[PDB]
CSV table of C-alpha atoms and ligand atoms in Angstrom, one decimal:
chain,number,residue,atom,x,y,z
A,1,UNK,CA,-2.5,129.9,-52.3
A,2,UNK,CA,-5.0,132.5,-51.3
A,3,UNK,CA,-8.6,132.1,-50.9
A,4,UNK,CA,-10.9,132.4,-53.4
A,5,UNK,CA,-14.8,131.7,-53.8
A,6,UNK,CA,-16.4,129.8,-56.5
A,7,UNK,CA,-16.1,131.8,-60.0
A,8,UNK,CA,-19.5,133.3,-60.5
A,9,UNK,CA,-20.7,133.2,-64.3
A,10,UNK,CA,-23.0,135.3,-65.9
A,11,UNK,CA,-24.1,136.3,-69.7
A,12,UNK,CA,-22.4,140.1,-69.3
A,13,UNK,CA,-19.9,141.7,-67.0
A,14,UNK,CA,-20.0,145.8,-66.6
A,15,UNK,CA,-16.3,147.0,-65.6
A,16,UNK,CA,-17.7,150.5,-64.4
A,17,UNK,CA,-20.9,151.6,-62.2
A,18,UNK,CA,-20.8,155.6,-63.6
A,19,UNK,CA,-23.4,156.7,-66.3
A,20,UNK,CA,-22.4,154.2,-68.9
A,21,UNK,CA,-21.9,151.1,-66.9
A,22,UNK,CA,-25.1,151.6,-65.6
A,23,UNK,CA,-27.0,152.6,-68.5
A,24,UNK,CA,-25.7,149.8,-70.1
A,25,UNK,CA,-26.6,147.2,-67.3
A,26,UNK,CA,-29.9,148.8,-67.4
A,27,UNK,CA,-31.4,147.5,-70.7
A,28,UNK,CA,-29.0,144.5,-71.1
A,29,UNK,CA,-30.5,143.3,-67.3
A,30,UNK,CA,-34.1,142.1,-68.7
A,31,UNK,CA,-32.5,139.7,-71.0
A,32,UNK,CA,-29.6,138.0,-69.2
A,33,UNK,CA,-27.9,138.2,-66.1
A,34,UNK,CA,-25.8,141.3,-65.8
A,35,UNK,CA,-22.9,141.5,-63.0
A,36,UNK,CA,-21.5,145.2,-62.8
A,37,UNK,CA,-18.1,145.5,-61.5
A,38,UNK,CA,-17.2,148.9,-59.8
A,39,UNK,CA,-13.7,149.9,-58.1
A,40,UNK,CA,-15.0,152.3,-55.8
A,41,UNK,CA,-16.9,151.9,-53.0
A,42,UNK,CA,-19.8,153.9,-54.5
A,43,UNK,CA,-20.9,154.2,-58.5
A,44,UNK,CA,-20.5,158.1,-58.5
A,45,UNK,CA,-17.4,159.0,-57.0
A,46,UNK,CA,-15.8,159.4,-60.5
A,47,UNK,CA,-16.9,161.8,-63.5
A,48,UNK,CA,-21.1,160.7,-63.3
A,49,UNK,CA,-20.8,162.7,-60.0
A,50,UNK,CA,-18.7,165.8,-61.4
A,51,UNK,CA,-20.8,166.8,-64.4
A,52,UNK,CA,-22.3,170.2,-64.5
A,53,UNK,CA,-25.9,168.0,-64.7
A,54,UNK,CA,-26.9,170.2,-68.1
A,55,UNK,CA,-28.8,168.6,-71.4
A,56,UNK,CA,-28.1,170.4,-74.5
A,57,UNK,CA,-28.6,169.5,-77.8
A,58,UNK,CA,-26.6,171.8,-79.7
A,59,UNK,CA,-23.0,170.6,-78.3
A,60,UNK,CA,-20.6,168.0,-79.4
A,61,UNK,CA,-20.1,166.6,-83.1
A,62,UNK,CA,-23.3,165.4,-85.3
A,63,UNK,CA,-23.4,161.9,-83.8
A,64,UNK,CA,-23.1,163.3,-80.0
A,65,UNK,CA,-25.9,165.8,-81.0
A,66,UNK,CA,-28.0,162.6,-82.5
A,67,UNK,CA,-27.5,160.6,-79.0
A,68,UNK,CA,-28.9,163.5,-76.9
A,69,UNK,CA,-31.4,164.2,-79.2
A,70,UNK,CA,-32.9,160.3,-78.9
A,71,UNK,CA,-31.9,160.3,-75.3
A,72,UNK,CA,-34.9,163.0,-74.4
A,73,UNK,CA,-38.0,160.7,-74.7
A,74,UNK,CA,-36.5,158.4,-71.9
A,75,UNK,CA,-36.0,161.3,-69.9
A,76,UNK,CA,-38.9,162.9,-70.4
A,77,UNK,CA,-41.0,160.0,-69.6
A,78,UNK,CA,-38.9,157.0,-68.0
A,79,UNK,CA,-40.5,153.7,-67.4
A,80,UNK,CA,-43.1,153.4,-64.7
A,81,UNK,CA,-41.3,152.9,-61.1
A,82,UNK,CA,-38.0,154.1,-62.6
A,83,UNK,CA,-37.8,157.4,-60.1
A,84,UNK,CA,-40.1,159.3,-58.2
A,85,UNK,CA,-39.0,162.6,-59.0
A,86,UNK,CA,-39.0,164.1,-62.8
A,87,UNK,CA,-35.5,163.7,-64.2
A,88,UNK,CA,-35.4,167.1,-66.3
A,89,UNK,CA,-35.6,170.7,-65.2
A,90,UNK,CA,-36.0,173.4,-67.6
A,91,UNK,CA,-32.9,175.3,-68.1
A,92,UNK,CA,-32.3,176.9,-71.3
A,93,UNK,CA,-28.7,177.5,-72.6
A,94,UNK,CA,-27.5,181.1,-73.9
A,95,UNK,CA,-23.9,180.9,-75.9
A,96,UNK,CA,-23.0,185.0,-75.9
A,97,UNK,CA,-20.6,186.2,-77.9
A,98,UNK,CA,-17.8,187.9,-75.9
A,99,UNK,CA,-15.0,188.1,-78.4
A,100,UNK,CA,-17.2,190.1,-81.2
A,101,UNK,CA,-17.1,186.9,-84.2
A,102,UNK,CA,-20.2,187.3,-85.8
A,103,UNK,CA,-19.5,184.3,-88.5
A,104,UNK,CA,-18.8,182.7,-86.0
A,105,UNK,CA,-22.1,182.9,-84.0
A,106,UNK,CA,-24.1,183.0,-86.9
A,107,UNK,CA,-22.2,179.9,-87.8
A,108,UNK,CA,-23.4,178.5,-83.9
A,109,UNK,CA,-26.9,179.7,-85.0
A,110,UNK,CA,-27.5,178.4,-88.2
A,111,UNK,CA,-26.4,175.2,-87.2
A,112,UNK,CA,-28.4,174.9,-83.6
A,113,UNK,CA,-31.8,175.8,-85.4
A,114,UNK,CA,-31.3,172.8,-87.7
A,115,UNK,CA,-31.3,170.4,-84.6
A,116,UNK,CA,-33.6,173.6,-82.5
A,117,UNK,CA,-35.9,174.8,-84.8
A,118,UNK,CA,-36.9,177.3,-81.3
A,119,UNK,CA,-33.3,178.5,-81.1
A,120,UNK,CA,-33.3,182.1,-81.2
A,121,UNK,CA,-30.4,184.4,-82.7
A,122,UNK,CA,-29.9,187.6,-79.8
A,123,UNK,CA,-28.6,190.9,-79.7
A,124,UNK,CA,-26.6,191.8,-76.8
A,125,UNK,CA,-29.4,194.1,-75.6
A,126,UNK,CA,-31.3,190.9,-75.5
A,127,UNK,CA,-28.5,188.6,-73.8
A,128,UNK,CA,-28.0,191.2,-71.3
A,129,UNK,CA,-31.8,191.3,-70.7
A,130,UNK,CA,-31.9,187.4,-69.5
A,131,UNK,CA,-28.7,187.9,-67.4
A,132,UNK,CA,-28.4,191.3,-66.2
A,133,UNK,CA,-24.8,190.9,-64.7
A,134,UNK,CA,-23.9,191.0,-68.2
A,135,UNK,CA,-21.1,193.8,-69.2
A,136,UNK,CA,-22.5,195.3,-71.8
A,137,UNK,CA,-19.6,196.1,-73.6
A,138,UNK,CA,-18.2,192.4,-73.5
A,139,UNK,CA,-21.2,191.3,-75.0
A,140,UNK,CA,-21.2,191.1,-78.6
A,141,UNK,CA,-24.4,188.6,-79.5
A,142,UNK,CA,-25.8,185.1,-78.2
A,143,UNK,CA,-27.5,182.0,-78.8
A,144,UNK,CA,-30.6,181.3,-77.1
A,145,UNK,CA,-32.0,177.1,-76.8
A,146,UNK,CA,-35.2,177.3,-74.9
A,147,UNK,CA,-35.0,173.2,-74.9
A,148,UNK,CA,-32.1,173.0,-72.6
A,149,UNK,CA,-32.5,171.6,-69.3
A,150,UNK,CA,-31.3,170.4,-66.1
A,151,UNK,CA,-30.8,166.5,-65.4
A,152,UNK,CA,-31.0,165.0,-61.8
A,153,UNK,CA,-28.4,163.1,-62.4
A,154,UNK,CA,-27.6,160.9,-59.0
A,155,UNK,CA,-31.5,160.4,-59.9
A,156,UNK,CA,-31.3,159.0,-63.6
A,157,UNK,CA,-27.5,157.0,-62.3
A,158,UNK,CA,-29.3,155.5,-58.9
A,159,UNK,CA,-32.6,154.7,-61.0
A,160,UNK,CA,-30.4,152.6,-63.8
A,161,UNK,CA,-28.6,150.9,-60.8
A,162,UNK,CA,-32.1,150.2,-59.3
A,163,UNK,CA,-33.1,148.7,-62.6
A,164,UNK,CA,-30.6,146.5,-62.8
A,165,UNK,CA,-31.2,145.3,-59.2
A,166,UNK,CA,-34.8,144.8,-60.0
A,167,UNK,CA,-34.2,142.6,-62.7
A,168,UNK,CA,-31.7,140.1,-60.7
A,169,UNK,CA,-28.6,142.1,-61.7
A,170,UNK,CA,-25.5,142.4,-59.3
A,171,UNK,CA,-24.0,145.7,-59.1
A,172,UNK,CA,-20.7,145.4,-57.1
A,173,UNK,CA,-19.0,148.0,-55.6
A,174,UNK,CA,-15.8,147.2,-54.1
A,175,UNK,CA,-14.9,145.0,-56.9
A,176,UNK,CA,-12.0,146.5,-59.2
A,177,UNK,CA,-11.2,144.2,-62.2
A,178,UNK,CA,-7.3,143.2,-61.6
A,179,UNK,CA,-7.1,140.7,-64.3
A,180,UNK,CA,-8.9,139.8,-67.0
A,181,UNK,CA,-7.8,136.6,-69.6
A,182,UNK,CA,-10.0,135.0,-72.5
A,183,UNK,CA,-10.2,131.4,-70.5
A,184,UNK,CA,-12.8,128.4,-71.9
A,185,UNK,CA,-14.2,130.5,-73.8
A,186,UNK,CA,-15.5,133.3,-71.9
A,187,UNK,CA,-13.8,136.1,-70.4
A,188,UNK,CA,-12.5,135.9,-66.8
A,189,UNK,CA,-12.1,138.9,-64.2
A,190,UNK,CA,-10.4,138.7,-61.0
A,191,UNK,CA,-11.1,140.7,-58.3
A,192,UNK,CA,-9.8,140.8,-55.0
A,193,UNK,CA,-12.1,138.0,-53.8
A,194,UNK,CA,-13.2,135.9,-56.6
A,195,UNK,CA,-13.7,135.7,-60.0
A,196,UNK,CA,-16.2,136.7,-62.8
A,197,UNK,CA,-17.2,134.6,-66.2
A,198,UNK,CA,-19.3,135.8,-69.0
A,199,UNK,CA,-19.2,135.0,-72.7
A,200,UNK,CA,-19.2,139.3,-72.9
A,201,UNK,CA,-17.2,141.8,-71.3
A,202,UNK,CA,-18.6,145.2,-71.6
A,203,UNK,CA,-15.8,148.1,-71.2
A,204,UNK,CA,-17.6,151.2,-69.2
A,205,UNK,CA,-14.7,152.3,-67.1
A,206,UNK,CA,-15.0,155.7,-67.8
A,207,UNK,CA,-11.3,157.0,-67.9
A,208,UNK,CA,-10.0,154.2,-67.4
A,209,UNK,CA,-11.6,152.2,-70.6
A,210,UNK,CA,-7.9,151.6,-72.2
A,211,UNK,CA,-6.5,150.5,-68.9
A,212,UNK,CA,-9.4,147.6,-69.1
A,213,UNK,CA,-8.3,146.6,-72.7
A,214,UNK,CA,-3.9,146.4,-71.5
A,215,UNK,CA,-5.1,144.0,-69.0
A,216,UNK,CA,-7.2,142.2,-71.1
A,217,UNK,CA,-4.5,142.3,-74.3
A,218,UNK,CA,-6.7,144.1,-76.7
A,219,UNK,CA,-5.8,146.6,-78.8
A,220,UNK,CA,-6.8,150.6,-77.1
A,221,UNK,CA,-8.8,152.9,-78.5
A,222,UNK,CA,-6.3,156.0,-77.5
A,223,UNK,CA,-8.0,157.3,-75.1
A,224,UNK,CA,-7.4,160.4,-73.8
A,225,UNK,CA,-9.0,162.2,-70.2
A,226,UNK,CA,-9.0,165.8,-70.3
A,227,UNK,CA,-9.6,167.5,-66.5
A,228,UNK,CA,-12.5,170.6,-66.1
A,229,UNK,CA,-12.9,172.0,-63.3
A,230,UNK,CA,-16.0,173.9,-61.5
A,231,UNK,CA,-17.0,175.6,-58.6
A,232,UNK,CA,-19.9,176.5,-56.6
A,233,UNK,CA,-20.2,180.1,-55.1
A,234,UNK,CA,-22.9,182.4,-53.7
A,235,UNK,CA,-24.6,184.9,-55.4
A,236,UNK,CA,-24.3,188.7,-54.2
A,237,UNK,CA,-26.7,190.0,-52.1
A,238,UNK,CA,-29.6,191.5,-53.9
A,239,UNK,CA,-28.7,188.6,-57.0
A,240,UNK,CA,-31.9,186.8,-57.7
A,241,UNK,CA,-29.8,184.5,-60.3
A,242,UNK,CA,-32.4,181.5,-59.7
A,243,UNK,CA,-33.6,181.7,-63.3
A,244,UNK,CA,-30.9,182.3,-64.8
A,245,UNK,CA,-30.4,180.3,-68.1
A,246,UNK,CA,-27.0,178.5,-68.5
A,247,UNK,CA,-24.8,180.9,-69.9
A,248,UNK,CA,-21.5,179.9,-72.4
A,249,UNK,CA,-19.1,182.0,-73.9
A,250,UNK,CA,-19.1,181.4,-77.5
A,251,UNK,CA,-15.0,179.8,-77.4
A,252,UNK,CA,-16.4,177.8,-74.4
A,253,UNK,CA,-13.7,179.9,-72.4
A,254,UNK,CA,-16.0,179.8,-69.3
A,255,UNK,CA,-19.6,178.8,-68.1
A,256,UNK,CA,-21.9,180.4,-65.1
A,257,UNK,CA,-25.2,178.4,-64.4
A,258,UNK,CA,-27.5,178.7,-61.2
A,259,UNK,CA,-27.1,175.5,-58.7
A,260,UNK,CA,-30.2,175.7,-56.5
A,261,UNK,CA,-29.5,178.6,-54.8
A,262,UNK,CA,-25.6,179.3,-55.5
A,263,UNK,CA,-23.8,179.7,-58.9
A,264,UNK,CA,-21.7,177.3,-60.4
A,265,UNK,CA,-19.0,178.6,-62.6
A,266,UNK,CA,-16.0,176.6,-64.6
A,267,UNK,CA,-13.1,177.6,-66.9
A,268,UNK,CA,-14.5,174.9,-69.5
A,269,UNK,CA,-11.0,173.3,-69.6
A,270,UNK,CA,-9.6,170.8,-71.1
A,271,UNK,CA,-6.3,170.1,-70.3
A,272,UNK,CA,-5.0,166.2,-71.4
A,273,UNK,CA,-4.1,164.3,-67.9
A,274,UNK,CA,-3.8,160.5,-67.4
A,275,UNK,CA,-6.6,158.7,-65.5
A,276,UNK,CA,-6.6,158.9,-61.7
A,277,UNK,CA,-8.9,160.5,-59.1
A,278,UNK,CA,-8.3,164.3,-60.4
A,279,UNK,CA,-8.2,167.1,-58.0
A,280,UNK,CA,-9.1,170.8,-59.2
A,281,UNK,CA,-6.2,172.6,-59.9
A,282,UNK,CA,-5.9,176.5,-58.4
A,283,UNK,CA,-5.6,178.2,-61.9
A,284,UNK,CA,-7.8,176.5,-63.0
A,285,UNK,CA,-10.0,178.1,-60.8
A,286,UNK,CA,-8.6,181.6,-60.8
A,287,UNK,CA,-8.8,181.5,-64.2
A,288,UNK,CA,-12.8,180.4,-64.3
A,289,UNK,CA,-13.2,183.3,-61.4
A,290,UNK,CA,-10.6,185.6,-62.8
A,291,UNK,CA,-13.2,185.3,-66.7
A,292,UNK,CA,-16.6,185.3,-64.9
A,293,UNK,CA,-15.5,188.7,-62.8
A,294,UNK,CA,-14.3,190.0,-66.3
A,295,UNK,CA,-17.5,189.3,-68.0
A,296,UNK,CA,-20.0,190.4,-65.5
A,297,UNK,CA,-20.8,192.6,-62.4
A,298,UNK,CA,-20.2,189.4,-60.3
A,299,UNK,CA,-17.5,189.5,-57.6
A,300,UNK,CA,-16.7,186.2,-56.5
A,301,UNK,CA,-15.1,185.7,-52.7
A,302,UNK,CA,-14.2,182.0,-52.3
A,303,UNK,CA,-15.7,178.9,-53.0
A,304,UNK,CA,-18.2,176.5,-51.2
A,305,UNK,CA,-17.0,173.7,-53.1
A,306,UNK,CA,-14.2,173.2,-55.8
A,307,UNK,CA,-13.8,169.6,-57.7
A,308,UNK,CA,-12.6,168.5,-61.4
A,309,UNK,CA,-13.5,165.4,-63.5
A,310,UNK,CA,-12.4,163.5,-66.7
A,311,UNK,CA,-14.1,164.1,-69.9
A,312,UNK,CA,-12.7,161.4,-71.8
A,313,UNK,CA,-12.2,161.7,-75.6
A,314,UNK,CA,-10.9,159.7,-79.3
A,315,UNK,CA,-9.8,161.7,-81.8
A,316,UNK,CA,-13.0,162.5,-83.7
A,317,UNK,CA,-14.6,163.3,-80.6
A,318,UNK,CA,-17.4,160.8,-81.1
A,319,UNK,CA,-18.7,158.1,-78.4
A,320,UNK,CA,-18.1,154.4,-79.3
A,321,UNK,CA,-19.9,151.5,-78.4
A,322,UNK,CA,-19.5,148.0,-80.2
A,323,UNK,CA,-17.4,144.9,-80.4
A,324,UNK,CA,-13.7,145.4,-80.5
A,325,UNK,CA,-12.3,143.7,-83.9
A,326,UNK,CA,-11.1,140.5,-83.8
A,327,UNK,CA,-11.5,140.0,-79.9
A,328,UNK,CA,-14.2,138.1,-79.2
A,329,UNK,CA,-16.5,139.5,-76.5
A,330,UNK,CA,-15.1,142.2,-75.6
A,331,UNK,CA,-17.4,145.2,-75.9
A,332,UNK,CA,-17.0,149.1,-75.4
A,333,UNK,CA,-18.9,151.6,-74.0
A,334,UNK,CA,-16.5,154.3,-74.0
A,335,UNK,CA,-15.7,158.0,-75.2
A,336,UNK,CA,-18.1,159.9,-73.4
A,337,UNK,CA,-16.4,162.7,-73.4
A,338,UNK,CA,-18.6,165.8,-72.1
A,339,UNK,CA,-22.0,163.9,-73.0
A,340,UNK,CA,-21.9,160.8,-71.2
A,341,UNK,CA,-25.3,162.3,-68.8
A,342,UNK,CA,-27.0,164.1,-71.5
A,343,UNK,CA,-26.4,160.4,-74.1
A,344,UNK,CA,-26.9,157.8,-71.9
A,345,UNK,CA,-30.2,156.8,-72.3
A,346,UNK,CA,-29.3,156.4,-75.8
A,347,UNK,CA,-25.9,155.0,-75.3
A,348,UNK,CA,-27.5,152.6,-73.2
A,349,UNK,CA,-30.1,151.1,-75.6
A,350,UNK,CA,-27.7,151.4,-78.3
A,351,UNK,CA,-24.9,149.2,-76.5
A,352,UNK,CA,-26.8,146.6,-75.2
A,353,UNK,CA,-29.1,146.0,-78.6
A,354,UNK,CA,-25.4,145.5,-80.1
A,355,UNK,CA,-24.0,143.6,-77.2
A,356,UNK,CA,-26.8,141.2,-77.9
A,357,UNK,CA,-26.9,141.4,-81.5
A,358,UNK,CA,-29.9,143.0,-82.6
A,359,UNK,CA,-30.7,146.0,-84.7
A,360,UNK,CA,-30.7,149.0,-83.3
A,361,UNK,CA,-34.4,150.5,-81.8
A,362,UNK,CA,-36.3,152.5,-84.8
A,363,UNK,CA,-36.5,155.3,-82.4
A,364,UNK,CA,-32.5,155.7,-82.3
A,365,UNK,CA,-32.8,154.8,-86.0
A,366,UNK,CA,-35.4,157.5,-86.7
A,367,UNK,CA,-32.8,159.8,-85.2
A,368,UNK,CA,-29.8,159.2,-87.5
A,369,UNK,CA,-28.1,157.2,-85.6
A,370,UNK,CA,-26.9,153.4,-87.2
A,371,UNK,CA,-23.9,150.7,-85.9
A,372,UNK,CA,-21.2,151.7,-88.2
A,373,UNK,CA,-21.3,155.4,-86.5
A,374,UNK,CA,-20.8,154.1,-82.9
A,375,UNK,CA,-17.9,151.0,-83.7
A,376,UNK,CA,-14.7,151.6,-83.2
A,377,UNK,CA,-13.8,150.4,-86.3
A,378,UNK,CA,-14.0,153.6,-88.0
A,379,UNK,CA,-10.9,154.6,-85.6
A,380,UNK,CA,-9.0,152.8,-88.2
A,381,UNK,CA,-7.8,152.5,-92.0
B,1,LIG,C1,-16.8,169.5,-64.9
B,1,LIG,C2,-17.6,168.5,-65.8
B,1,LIG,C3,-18.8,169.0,-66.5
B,1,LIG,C4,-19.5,168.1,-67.2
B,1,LIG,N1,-20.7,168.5,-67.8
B,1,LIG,C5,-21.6,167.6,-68.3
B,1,LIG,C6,-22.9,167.9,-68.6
B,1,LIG,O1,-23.4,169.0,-68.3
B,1,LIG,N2,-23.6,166.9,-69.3
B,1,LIG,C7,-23.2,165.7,-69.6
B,1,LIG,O2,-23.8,164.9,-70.3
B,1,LIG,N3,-21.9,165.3,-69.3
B,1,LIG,C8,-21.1,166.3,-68.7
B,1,LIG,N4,-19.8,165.9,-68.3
B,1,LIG,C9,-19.3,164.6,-68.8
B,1,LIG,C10,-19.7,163.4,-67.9
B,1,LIG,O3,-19.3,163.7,-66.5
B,1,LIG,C11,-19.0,162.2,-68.4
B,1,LIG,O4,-19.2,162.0,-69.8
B,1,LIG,C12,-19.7,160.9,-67.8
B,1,LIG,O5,-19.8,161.0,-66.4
B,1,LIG,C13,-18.7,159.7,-68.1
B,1,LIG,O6,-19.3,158.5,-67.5
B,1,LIG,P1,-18.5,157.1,-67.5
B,1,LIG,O7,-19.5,156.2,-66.9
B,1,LIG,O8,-17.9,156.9,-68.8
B,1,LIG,O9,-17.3,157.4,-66.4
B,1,LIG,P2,-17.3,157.3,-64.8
B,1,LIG,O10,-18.4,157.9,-64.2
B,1,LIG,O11,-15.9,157.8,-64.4
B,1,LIG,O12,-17.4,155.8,-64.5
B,1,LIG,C14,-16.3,154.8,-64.8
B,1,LIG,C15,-16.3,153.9,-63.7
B,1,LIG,O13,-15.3,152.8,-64.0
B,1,LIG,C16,-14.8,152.4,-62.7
B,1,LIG,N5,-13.5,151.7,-63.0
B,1,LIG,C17,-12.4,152.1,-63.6
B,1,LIG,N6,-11.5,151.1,-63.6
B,1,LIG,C18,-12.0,150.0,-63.1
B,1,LIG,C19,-11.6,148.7,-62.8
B,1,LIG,N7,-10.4,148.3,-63.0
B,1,LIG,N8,-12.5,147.9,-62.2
B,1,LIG,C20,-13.8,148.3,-61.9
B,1,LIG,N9,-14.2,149.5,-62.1
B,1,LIG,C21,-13.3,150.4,-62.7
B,1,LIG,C22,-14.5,153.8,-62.1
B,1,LIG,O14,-14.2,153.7,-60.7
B,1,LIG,C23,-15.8,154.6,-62.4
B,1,LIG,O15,-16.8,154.5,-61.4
B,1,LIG,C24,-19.1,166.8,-67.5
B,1,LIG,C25,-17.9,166.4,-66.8
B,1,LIG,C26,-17.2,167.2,-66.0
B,1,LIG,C27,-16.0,166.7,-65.2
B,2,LIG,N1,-23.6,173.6,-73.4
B,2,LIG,C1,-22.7,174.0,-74.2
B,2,LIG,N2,-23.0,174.5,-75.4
B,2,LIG,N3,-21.4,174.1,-73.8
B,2,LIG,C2,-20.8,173.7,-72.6
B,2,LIG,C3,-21.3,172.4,-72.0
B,2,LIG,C4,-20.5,172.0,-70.7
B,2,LIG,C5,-20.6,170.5,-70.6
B,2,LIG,N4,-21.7,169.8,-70.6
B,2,LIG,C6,-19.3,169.9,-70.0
B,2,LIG,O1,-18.9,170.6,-69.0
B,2,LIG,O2,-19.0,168.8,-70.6
């Protein structure tokens, strides 16, 4: 009995505008029409806007390493008229030692120079030397990647959204997926105003990716959002922190990396939450404070701006993108976990040469990535 316009059909809906909506949407747009379906009245306002905008190779399991490692050519050198600006900024990574492990970072060494071959093994004379706020007698030994970098990442979101646009794509913000039902063959999704057909249903909805598959009765993947939380404060006077590499404990206890001008800092957390618009929580932030005061000279006084995110996770901690099993259609893009920036130009050539059934590129190939690694059939025996 209420108003509705005409169902709108298409060959691929996109429930979620973040990173992996839109990366998705981004290659799939030049061979079919893509609609992209987005609760919120802007793409971002989830985790693609609360990353700490960092690119590291050396992070994550073996087939998280592989997707950043093929994501760099795309940002390195996009498409001409993707963005005006370059998309990475150099900003090496340094992993120190602060609980005195040595097989443990020579474990985090060995392993890094495989992927690094520049990846340097410090001393703590040498960490110190890079960031002088260093205590020396916390500092027991780093890492050094002088490949990391910064990623503009409302840049590299906004210039996927733009290429969808460009080639005749919808993206709709506004437009939270209520239902969703397998109907004449395609699947169907209300939204508040009218309804969406397409013979695919691609599953980027972040956090939310399970909730997607209750309405739509398919079986979940399991899941699960884990809140971090940052902050942004100034430096001391008399800090000039603007070259500072990003610095990581070697237990990821806490992070400190220079954001323009001021510092962000972060406890690394992790703790398991459900999905809803998180908030930071104060320990959380004591705690990151409470750490970076510990480890260096810095004194903090209070924030400029405090916010947490989901990094969503399955249990081997890989991404997945391919068809669910025996539902027809219904595609995800899910698992991002604390890569989802850093892996979604890969992500996003990998899903949508699946979604439309082709091999995947040689230059993913090339990088040791293949289907069966990225399906989520392998959550299963
Ligand atoms: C503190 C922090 C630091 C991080 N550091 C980094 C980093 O340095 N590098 C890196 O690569 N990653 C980092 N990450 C991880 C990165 O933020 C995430 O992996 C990535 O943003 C996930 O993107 P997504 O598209 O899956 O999720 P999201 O950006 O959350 O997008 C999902 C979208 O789905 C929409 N949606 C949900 N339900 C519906 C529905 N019913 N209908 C329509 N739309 C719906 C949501 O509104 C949302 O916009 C960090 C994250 C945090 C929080
Ligand atoms: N770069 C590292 N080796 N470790 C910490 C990375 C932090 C990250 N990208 C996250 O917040 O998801």
């Amino acid at each position: 009995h209420h108003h509705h316009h005409h169902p709108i059909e298409a060959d691929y809906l996109v429930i979620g505008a973040g990173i992996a909506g839109a990366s998705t949407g981004y290659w799939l747009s030049a061979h079919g029409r893509v609609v992209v379906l987005e609760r919120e009245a802007q793409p971002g306002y989830h985790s693609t806007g609360r990353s700490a905008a960092h690119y590291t190779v050396a992070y994550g399991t073996p087939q998280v390493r592989a997707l950043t490692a093929a994501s760099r050519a795309f940002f390195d050198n996009p498409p001409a008229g993707f963005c005006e600006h370059p998309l990475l900024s150099p900003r090496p990574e340094m992993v120190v030692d602060f609980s005195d492990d040595p097989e443990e970072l020579r474990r985090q060494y060995e392993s890094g120079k495989a992927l690094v071959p520049q990846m340097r093994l410090l001393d703590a004379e040498q960490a110190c030397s890079i960031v002088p706020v260093l205590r020396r007698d916390k500092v027991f030994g780093a890492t050094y990647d002088p490949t990391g970098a910064d990623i503009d990442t409302d840049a590299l979101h906004q210039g996927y959204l733009r290429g969808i646009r460009r080639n005749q794509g919808q993206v709709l913000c506004n437009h939270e997926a209520l239902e969703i039902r397998r109907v004449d063959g395609a699947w169907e999704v209300r939204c508040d105003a009218g309804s969406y057909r397409a013979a695919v249903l691609v599953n980027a909805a972040g956090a939310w990716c399970d909730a997607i598959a209750g309405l739509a009765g398919v079986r979940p993947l399991g899941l699960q959002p884990k809140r971090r939380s940052a902050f942004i404060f100034a430096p001391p006077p008399g800090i000039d922190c603007h070259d500072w590499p990003m610095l990581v404990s070697l237990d990821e206890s806490f992070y400190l990396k220079p954001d323009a001008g001021m510092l962000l800092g972060s406890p690394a957390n992790a703790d398991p939450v459900e999905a809803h618009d998180v908030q930071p929580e104060q320990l959380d932030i004591a705690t990151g404070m409470y750490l970076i005061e510990e480890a260096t000279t810095l004194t903090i006084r209070r924030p400029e701006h405090t916010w947490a995110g989901l990094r969503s996770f399955v249990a081997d901690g890989d991404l997945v993108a391919g068809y669910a099993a025996n539902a027809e259609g219904f595609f995800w893009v899910a698992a991002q976990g604390g890569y989802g920036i850093q892996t979604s130009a890969a992500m996003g050539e990998a899903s949508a040469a699946l979604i439309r059934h082709q091999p995947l590129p040689a230059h993913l190939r090339e990088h040791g990535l293949d289907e069966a690694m990225l399906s989520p059939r392998r959550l299963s025996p």
